Enzyme design. Structure first.
Site, PDB file in Angstrom:
ATOM      1  N   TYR B 171      57.297  -9.410  62.172  1.00  0.00           N
ATOM      2  CA  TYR B 171      56.430  -8.796  62.189  1.00  0.00           C
ATOM      3  C   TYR B 171      56.316  -8.382  60.507  1.00  0.00           C
ATOM      4  CZ  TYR B 171      53.112  -4.474  62.182  1.00  0.00           C
ATOM      5  OH  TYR B 171      51.497  -3.986  62.065  1.00  0.00           O
ATOM      6  N   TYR B 181      56.568   1.858  60.903  1.00  0.00           N
ATOM      7  CA  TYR B 181      57.474   1.092  61.567  1.00  0.00           C
ATOM      8  C   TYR B 181      58.898   1.235  61.035  1.00  0.00           C
ATOM      9  CZ  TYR B 181      58.589  -3.622  63.315  1.00  0.00           C
ATOM     10  OH  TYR B 181      58.936  -4.596  64.217  1.00  0.00           O
TER      11      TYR B 181
HETATM   12  N1  LIG Z   1      53.641  -5.919  70.093  1.00  0.00           N
HETATM   13  C1  LIG Z   1      54.242  -6.204  68.533  1.00  0.00           C
HETATM   14  O1  LIG Z   1      53.169  -5.396  68.093  1.00  0.00           O
HETATM   15  C2  LIG Z   1      54.438  -6.751  67.884  1.00  0.00           C
HETATM   16  C3  LIG Z   1      54.402  -7.649  66.402  1.00  0.00           C
HETATM   17  C4  LIG Z   1      54.943  -8.448  66.159  1.00  0.00           C
HETATM   18  C5  LIG Z   1      56.014  -8.854  65.975  1.00  0.00           C
HETATM   19  N2  LIG Z   1      56.924  -8.378  67.697  1.00  0.00           N
HETATM   20  C6  LIG Z   1      58.003  -9.012  68.444  1.00  0.00           C
HETATM   21  O2  LIG Z   1      57.889  -9.511  69.422  1.00  0.00           O
HETATM   22  C7  LIG Z   1      58.759  -9.823  69.958  1.00  0.00           C
HETATM   23  C8  LIG Z   1      58.660  -8.811  71.791  1.00  0.00           C
HETATM   24  O3  LIG Z   1      58.051  -7.106  71.419  1.00  0.00           O
HETATM   25  P1  LIG Z   1      57.248  -7.179  72.474  1.00  0.00           P
HETATM   26  O4  LIG Z   1      56.103  -5.720  71.526  1.00  0.00           O
HETATM   27  O5  LIG Z   1      56.358  -8.669  73.443  1.00  0.00           O
HETATM   28  O6  LIG Z   1      57.871  -5.947  73.121  1.00  0.00           O
HETATM   29  P2  LIG Z   1      58.231  -6.110  74.506  1.00  0.00           P
HETATM   30  O7  LIG Z   1      59.039  -4.526  75.574  1.00  0.00           O
HETATM   31  O8  LIG Z   1      57.830  -6.966  75.653  1.00  0.00           O
HETATM   32  O9  LIG Z   1      60.092  -6.872  74.685  1.00  0.00           O
HETATM   33  C9  LIG Z   1      61.342  -6.427  74.301  1.00  0.00           C
HETATM   34  C10 LIG Z   1      61.571  -6.830  75.542  1.00  0.00           C
HETATM   35  O10 LIG Z   1      62.819  -6.451  74.432  1.00  0.00           O
HETATM   36  C11 LIG Z   1      63.803  -6.001  75.564  1.00  0.00           C
HETATM   37  N3  LIG Z   1      65.294  -6.353  75.450  1.00  0.00           N
HETATM   38  C12 LIG Z   1      65.353  -4.850  74.157  1.00  0.00           C
HETATM   39  N4  LIG Z   1      66.570  -5.063  73.072  1.00  0.00           N
HETATM   40  C13 LIG Z   1      67.354  -5.886  74.337  1.00  0.00           C
HETATM   41  C14 LIG Z   1      68.824  -6.481  73.886  1.00  0.00           C
HETATM   42  N5  LIG Z   1      69.884  -5.083  74.056  1.00  0.00           N
HETATM   43  N6  LIG Z   1      69.213  -7.758  75.061  1.00  0.00           N
HETATM   44  C15 LIG Z   1      67.978  -8.116  76.048  1.00  0.00           C
HETATM   45  N7  LIG Z   1      66.488  -7.665  75.766  1.00  0.00           N
HETATM   46  C16 LIG Z   1      66.810  -6.594  75.413  1.00  0.00           C
HETATM   47  C17 LIG Z   1      63.596  -4.803  76.493  1.00  0.00           C
HETATM   48  O11 LIG Z   1      63.615  -5.074  77.872  1.00  0.00           O
HETATM   49  C18 LIG Z   1      61.475  -6.089  75.990  1.00  0.00           C
HETATM   50  O12 LIG Z   1      61.636  -6.559  77.140  1.00  0.00           O
HETATM   51  C19 LIG Z   1      60.421  -8.394  69.514  1.00  0.00           C
HETATM   52  O13 LIG Z   1      60.936  -8.923  68.734  1.00  0.00           O
HETATM   53  C20 LIG Z   1      58.732  -7.422  68.889  1.00  0.00           C
HETATM   54  O14 LIG Z   1      59.250  -6.835  66.860  1.00  0.00           O
HETATM   55  C21 LIG Z   1      56.230  -7.571  68.878  1.00  0.00           C
HETATM   56  C1  LIG Z   2      62.124   0.412  69.790  1.00  0.00           C
HETATM   57  C2  LIG Z   2      61.878  -1.236  70.029  1.00  0.00           C
HETATM   58  C3  LIG Z   2      62.429  -1.368  71.772  1.00  0.00           C
HETATM   59  C4  LIG Z   2      62.354  -2.556  72.414  1.00  0.00           C
HETATM   60  O1  LIG Z   2      62.980  -3.069  73.432  1.00  0.00           O
HETATM   61  O2  LIG Z   2      61.136  -3.556  71.985  1.00  0.00           O
HETATM   62  C5  LIG Z   2      60.763  -2.867  70.662  1.00  0.00           C
HETATM   63  C6  LIG Z   2      59.664  -4.311  70.188  1.00  0.00           C
HETATM   64  C7  LIG Z   2      59.496  -3.884  69.048  1.00  0.00           C
HETATM   65  O3  LIG Z   2      58.124  -4.938  68.691  1.00  0.00           O
HETATM   66  C8  LIG Z   2      56.686  -3.891  68.591  1.00  0.00           C
HETATM   67  C9  LIG Z   2      55.730  -3.964  68.304  1.00  0.00           C
HETATM   68  C10 LIG Z   2      55.213  -3.331  67.713  1.00  0.00           C
HETATM   69  C11 LIG Z   2      54.879  -3.461  66.469  1.00  0.00           C
HETATM   70 CL1  LIG Z   2      53.473  -3.772  65.189  1.00  0.00          CL
HETATM   71  C12 LIG Z   2      56.206  -4.692  66.339  1.00  0.00           C
HETATM   72  C13 LIG Z   2      56.678  -4.815  66.905  1.00  0.00           C
HETATM   73  O4  LIG Z   2      58.324  -5.089  66.437  1.00  0.00           O
HETATM   74  C14 LIG Z   2      59.559  -2.572  67.939  1.00  0.00           C
HETATM   75  C15 LIG Z   2      60.592  -1.777  68.466  1.00  0.00           C
HETATM   76  C16 LIG Z   2      60.728  -2.053  70.174  1.00  0.00           C
END
Ligand SMILES: NC(=O)c1ccc[n+]([C@@H]2O[C@H](COP(=O)([O-])OP(=O)(O)OC[C@H]3O[C@@H](n4cnc5c(N)ncnc54)[C@H](O)[C@@H]3O)[C@@H](O)[C@H]2O)c1
Ligand SMILES: Cc1cc(=O)oc2cc(Oc3ccc(Cl)cc3O)ccc12
Ligand SMILES: NC(=O)c1ccc[n+]([C@@H]2O[C@H](COP(=O)([O-])OP(=O)(O)OC[C@H]3O[C@@H](n4cnc5c(N)ncnc54)[C@H](O)[C@@H]3O)[C@@H](O)[C@H]2O)c1
Ligand SMILES: Cc1cc(=O)oc2cc(Oc3ccc(Cl)cc3O)ccc12
Lengths: 284, 287
Positions: B171, B181
């Site tokens: 991100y 964040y």
């Molecule tokens: N949602 C957003 O706006 C956003 C934006 C940019 C980047 N991301 C990145 O995308 C990736 C997925 O995030 P998301 O937003 O789709 O959330 P998400 O909830 O779909 O995925 C996070 C997953 O990681 C799993 N997890 C956490 N700790 C773990 C561990 N110890 N071992 C195995 N699994 C574990 C959780 O169970 C969860 O399913 C992350 O790297 C996040 O930082 C998300």
């Molecule tokens: C704290 C935490 C726990 C988890 O399981 O997934 C996560 C996934 C996360 O994903 C995001 C969500 C929104 C944005 Cl804008 C950026 C991200 O990296 C953040 C933080 C966590």
């Protein structure tokens, strides 16, 4: 169906050809914009079958070239041609300014949805930046950078919504490459910056995307003309994270992806397609 | 035929599912690695058909999932699992969920694979701003969100073919300030992007394996919601108002870019941070 105009093909040894080949795999119809001084040479070679092996896509298909047109990125409209209009190599050609090629393509084929800028020029490329004349520097910006803006300005009118555009750039914009002279570095810097600003205006106003591919070195005819390219290739193949040889079709497949709906959420970006060389600081 | 391991799927609302869906569309076989706290819940919902609609790719194509395995990226090997976790209610029934064991399991069951997705993040103190994050919290964020990529690579390279490809998700808060964040998540993403380069060097030279990271725009995933003390609603609304492309960012938008980077079409790309965010990253001043 899909039509791509590719501005900047002089032969089959450049990135434009590679992009054409790869787009062909996806059944995209290709129109070449060819710089007038080499237009008839190209047509001659093509008709003589010199490019036939190069046109082969796979066991089943060859490249579908819809048309080949003279195109000069120096001139926006018919009102800008100096003389030149009656130069030996321009005189038997017509409608080759950016706007004219846009009207011609539109008249013959209707709207397109892919646009490739694949051209650079700098009359003083052999001089280093500090010894480049004003005339030389501005020629480089005019031909290598402004032409992108002008291409967008005239072609948006003949494009479909959700269309996509790319250009090619080089890392000399961001880090110093001695040998990349004549304002070429400056031109690529402007090009990468303009890609963002254009992405804003094209995105908000037309939902059209635009990106640039920063390529690694390729022994194209133009590069050979700057050797510098042999050094750059040898250096890239020795030190890049990936040691395979960089092919024009490696840029082509990336271009093909940026030009398709699969990249619908990517715009305004400089995408490095260079075997990872840009990430290195200290050669091992 | 292509096989991909996706680490970090807990439901159909995050980027992992979007990635799985786009991959299956291209007939890649997919293996889900699921965090043990949500593993039984996920399996149950799956078996009860709760995900059926989400598995619909298009009018006549549906996702096929090759396998679903308990997976905890906190643990490198069986020897790293503390007694408490090992005996915890949600972990006690499960096995082979460390990074080393899941790779070994996958290899034994399916042979070598060629695609690897890191789609996880975690941080105990995400709700605190950086200045108020404890040492323990920060290191937790780095351990779970960043080191886990290194370890995944270290163990999975031995079960991957040459020319294989790896991606993770990051991100833009790594590079520019996003105040909410917290908890060292910003730091963790900075480290992840930098590590992506260094890893691309080692993996490229020694294995002909590529690695990149996707800097995604905001998505209302279950995890994104946990950030507020919402943060993600603001981020999404802001993105849709100010990005060059004003359209809802979808998980499958990231998914098709992920598919491209995992495929041979991107063979000359490695070590890169690729932004898939409707262009938001390029703006300075909101108009
Ligand atoms: N949602 C957003 O706006 C956003 C934006 C940019 C980047 N991301 C990145 O995308 C990736 C997925 O995030 P998301 O937003 O789709 O959330 P998400 O909830 O779909 O995925 C996070 C997953 O990681 C799993 N997890 C956490 N700790 C773990 C561990 N110890 N071992 C195995 N699994 C574990 C959780 O169970 C969860 O399913 C992350 O790297 C996040 O930082 C998300
Ligand atoms: C704290 C935490 C726990 C988890 O399981 O997934 C996560 C996934 C996360 O994903 C995001 C969500 C929104 C944005 Cl804008 C950026 C991200 O990296 C953040 C933080 C966590
Ligand atoms: N060769 C490389 O290592 C390299 C690396 C990075 C980026 N690029 C970029 O890729 C693009 C194509 O370069 P190439 O290396 O494939 O060279 P090339 O010889 O294949 O093509 C450059 C083309 O631009 C055309 N051209 C020059 N001036 C023109 C004008 N006034 N109007 C219309 N066309 C004109 C030339 O005829 C030539 O065909 C250029 O933008 C270049 O900067 C090349
Ligand atoms: C001066 C000039 C004229 C031309 O037609 O194409 C060009 C294409 C050019 O392309 C390049 C070649 C090698 C590298 Cl490493 C980078 C490049 O941008 C450069 C310069 C010219």
């Amino acid at each position: 169906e899909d039509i791509c105009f590719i501005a900047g093909i002089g032969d089959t040894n450049g990135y434009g050809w590679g992009i054409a080949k790869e787009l062909s795999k996806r059944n995209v119809k290709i129109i070449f914009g060819i710089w007038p001084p080499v237009y008839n040479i190209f047509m001659k070679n093509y008709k003589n079958g010199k490019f036939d092996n190069d046109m082969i896509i796979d066991k089943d298909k060859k490249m579908n070239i819809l048309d080949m047109l003279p195109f000069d990125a120096s001139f926006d409209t018919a009102n800008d041609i100096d003389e030149t209009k009656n130069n030996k190599r321009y005189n038997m050609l017509q409608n080759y300014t950016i706007e004219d090629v846009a009207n011609l393509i539109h008249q013959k084929y209707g709207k397109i949805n892919m646009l490739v800028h694949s051209l650079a020029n700098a009359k003083e490329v052999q001089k280093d930046l500090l010894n480049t004349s004003r005339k030389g520097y501005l020629d480089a910006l005019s031909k290598s950078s402004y032409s992108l803006i002008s291409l967008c300005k005239y072609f948006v009118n003949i494009m479909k919504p959700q269309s996509s555009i790319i250009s090619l750039t080089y890392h000399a914009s961001q880090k110093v490459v001695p040998g990349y002279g004549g304002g070429m570095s400056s031109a690529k810097a402007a090009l990468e910056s303009d890609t963002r600003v254009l992405a804003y205006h094209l995105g908000r106003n037309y939902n059209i995307r635009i990106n640039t591919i920063s390529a690694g070195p390729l022994k194209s005819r133009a590069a050979t003309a700057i050797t510098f390219i042999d050094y750059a290739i040898e250096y890239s193949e020795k030190y890049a994270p990936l040691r395979q040889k960089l092919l024009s079709t490696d840029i082509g497949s990336v271009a093909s992806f940026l030009l398709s709906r699969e990249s619908r959420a990517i715009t305004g970006q400089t995408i490095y397609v260079d075997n990872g060389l840009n990430i290195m600081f200290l050669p091992d």
